[PDB]
Design a protein around this ligand. Structure first.
Ligand code: NA
Ligand code: NA
Ligand code: NA
Lengths: 307, 307, 307, 307, 307
């Protein structure tokens, strides 16, 4: 095979779309292999700029195509340089821009700890014809800085693995596995905006929903709970635009569920308190000891749910 | 005709847009036919990368164009390889990315069970000049995994059928039918998010709407029902962004309809209870036996509506 | 002139955007004219696939360009075949995809009855150099089926007319008129979703707004009407995302107007009832005979407004 | 210089985006200059269709590039004809489609009276090498018709002016000014939809906010004003999606401001009426003469604000 | 190296997207270097228009590619002129259009004072082979005018710095640093729209929330505070569409936080006032001296928070 050395530079990571679970990564790729010795004008290496490499490719120069596996849509490439040394090595430098995708598990939404994965693999040549020697990822632009609400932490993990493509084994009998480079960049979500915009207001809504039992008569406490339910409904919408449709529940969706549960349990308890009287003579105070018991049970529920 | 063998690899299915009834499918296509024996440099097969196939096509090589019938917009193709063996066969490998469309029947919205259809057909050569022998679809990347809220279940159904184009019979007298490949991938929607975000909150709203009859006087129970109607209105909006405009009603839209019906039937019943008095002396308890009859009728309605 | 025969095939009509008054039409166009006899390899006709027609065009073959007049944006063309018979005729087959536009009058919004218009006209050759003989439109894919909320009814109307371009008369003295093909596909909007989502809920809101006069005192009936107005406001928004900004009023906007009018007329009547007392001794029942007169006038208003 | 005559045809103006202050204009451009006499096949003029003009341009034909100065993004050109007469003149006909921009002053929002400006200027040749003789704009398609909510009024104003580019004076010593064509199309916004959707409902909200002073006690009138403020808040949002962020206030934003001012002045006046009692014995009627004075002052404010 | 002189002209800055922290800059770039003397037809300089420069580039002319570092997506270039003087200098004039990005710190949101940064750097040639001599930025189109809600103030700051690329040092031993031009355009946000749309309405909401303590009994003051909280919730949403997710709090988000704090502190104080009675005989006036103390503390909080 041909020993190909890659040096991926990351310019910036931007536009991390949580709803679509995609992100956009800019930067440069510098692939370098070796070939036969060639003659250049002077001792200096030749610079082959874009839209003119095609004359060299139609001349017979071996320029492989390196594609991104996990990309969404066509990667919007820009300028490209094919720098030709006369000692033998050929260097393909290109700028890439594309939307990449990952799994992006969302069990803990505001306190999330995710990673951004770049995958590179030759489109046509397998590991018997093109082998990745090593990659050095230069994430010095975003090594210790925060993009949007994501704090990039650590360096970039590099890994070279041989992926196997069983769909291509009908045209290649034995050699049908490809050398893939994986680049992993960790990212920790900053939870401050969610903390002061969704979590603590909903805690205040929960305390206000607890405040129904301090009232004195029945219609006023029903109307208190109804306008409280209105608030919880409105809040549920606010969360929609912050995270996609998930089979599980996150922290904020669990808080919405707890708000609905608290308010409707209060309404049902108030109804059962009102219809407690068989002949309309009994006072209703024995069941209304939930001024100091219902918040305690709610705190126990929250403490269990945190762990 | 020419026997063409296709091997479609599916990389990932993403972005299933329910409102537009489209979805995006990435992956590779490997078409393979046979031709005259040719000579290559060495015994090894020749690899013809992208943007250089045109020299071979202008030289006179037969490379058919395979289009997607059910695609929405232009399919955003990427890299392509035209691998030439010297024993005779020509292999056209290409990467595709495009938005596909299907019927996507939506009778049961959250408990839906849909399929994703890929259709492939030659644009110009009919079955008398190009015949699809067989297709093996390698859906091993998403065989037993869930994309977004869709759990992909089973393998990919393959079918080769001869579709007939009557619009082209004016230029082709007898042979005007084309061989189309259909690839069917089943998908079952995960109903959990809808279950805890729309169905059970609306059930709590229904119980709260039932709670009007436990009040004691008239203006308070009218205001109770009015703020309850407000909630149902708000909920109706939340559903809009989850499913398109349909002639029929789904489960959630039927729940909104049942909420409106319950609240307005309660308001009309309360009004008729108030105006039951001919001279203002009669008590109103005979018509207010709906504390234990109106929910029973609603449960009967729901049980009939489920089946 | 040259007699050109067109056979437009319609694959699917999708994405009818009411707010933008555009729609997207896929399918194929098959133009066919006649020319000098030519020699082909063998007796079989020659197939000229895409991205290779340019060699024949630079060789000197007459391939006219047919553009779409009413299109919005560039029509996203795909594959194209230039099928050359040796008996003389040249057949240009191409696939088109583009957003088309029409007037789309919206007097009756949910019970609308619209049409989809495709217009085709040569860009450069007038009727003295290129004449459309006839068109057969093959709308067999959507002849008797419903797209989105639009039920396609009937076949496709064909018409050939000579349009006149006065802007081009400075460069062409007498012959400056072009032969345009118009294809009309009727479509009837399915009113069910609007009927059970906007019309009947707003009727329930109207009845609830009528329900104010059954109350007994003043502050409660003012608050009843205020929360009712809140509902009407919310509903007005829901309609915004369903139809564009229009100088006139549709059915649903007239229902919103009637809701505002009913509620504010009720508020003004209640205020005038309260201030009817010169010395605070008169009872207010003479002006509150609108329990059985205000709905009757509203029904008369609605019956007049329907016709 | 070379005398260039332009004849701009306007097909349709659509998609006037008020928030972005852009609009989309379709149509054709017909540029015509004169040159050396040439020989054509026969006496007829030659038609040079698109994607084949490049052979004539590489042959040495002078085809200038005319760009649009005020365009947003790349103007999506379509088909183009380079019609060559043998008597000497060369005619460049092209179809354009692009998003144009203007200042679009918005002092009176619903009763606005705007214009749509098209600017054309050669990219490379100044007025010493290419001079625009005259332009005739053929706006006969939209001369007396209304697009969206904009009624196009009058014809299209034509003007040829020499614009000066000081950035290019480092490479051109004296001749660095360019001949620009400006095309002005007036448009009057139809105010009906805003009149019955925002202005008159907000007037009803204003009258309902005036209705607080007719109540009898304090808590009910505070709650009346609070639910009224809720309505005004909701209305403020509805306006957001109709006009961009502006330093000044339009009519509708002034109505929102007047609604907030009326309601909060009523709340402050009610509070000062309640705390008017030094010992709780005084009646509060002297300050509540605003049943017939507060609307009069509001009418004076509105009459001053209109002029 | 080669001395390259740049003269950037700015046509217009538009579409400053605060949520994405990007902006769009149109205009022209005029690069100029020197080379060997050449012969042109006549004494006049040669004009090389677009899509024909490639013949000169394949002939062997040195045209460097200048890229934008901070751009988002591919910069949508338009027409380009390569003006060749016979005295030796080569002038590359091109039009650019692209979305640029900056840090855009948002500590004070409505009273913001930002800058727009354009960065230009050769893609392939380092400072040993191409050196930027000087840049004159001609921002005369927007020198003293306001774009959208941004008032452009001052001229454009020019700076030439040598940036160092450590990722490219594996292919270049010592010379691996590039000359970058930075263009800084200051912009001050106009705070009027936010001042009369968010700040003063929320101040009125704060005063209305203070108004709870003037009521007389308990259930009415709880319901007053609940409908007030509803308003604050609604307002929080309005702000979402005006600024992105930030770790810190701006002015308007601090006002939302203060509204929630004031209302929930009022609710807690009212609850503690109600449960102040050990046996139900004590009057509650000592803790309700916050009619003239709670606003004073709120004013102290606001005065501290401003500085
Ligand atoms: Na309320
Ligand atoms: Na509300
Ligand atoms: Na919304």
């Amino acid at each position: 095979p041909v020993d190909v050395s890659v040096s991926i530079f990351i310019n910036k990571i931007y536009g991390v779309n949580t709803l679509e679970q995609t992100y956009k990564v800019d930067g440069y790729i510098v692939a370098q292999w070796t070939g036969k010795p060639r003659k250049t004008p002077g001792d200096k290496p030749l610079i082959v700029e874009n839209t003119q490499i095609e004359r060299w490719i139609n001349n017979g120069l071996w320029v492989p195509a390196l594609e991104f596996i996990n990309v969404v849509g066509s990667p919007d490439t820009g300028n490209k340089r094919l720098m030709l040394f006369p000692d033998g090595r050929v260097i393909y430098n290109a700028r890439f821009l594309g939307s990449f995708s990952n799994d992006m598990d969302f069990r803990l939404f505001p306190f999330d700890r995710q990673q951004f994965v770049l995958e590179l693999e030759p489109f046509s040549y397998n590991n018997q014809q093109l082998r990745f020697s090593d990659i050095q990822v230069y994430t010095e632009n975003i090594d210790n800085e925060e993009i949007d609400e994501w704090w990039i932490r650590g360096k970039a993990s590099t890994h070279i693995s041989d992926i196997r493509y069983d769909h291509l084994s009908s045209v290649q009998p034995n050699q049908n596995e490809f050398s893939r480079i994986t680049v992993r960049i960790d990212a920790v979500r900053n939870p401050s905006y969610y903390l002061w915009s969704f979590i603590l207001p909903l805690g205040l809504i929960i305390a206000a929903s607890w405040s129904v039992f301090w009232l004195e008569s029945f219609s006023e406490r029903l109307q208190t709970s109804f306008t409280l339910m209105l608030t919880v409904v409105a809040y549920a919408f606010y969360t929609s635009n912050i995270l996609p449709r998930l089979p599980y529940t996150t922290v904020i969706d669990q808080m919405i569920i707890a708000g609905y549960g608290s308010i409707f349990a209060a309404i049902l308890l108030i109804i059962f308190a009102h219809h407690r009287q068989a002949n309309g003579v009994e006072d209703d105070l024995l069941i209304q000891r939930c001024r100091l018991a219902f918040p305690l049970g709610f705190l126990a529920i929250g403490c269990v749910l945190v762990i």
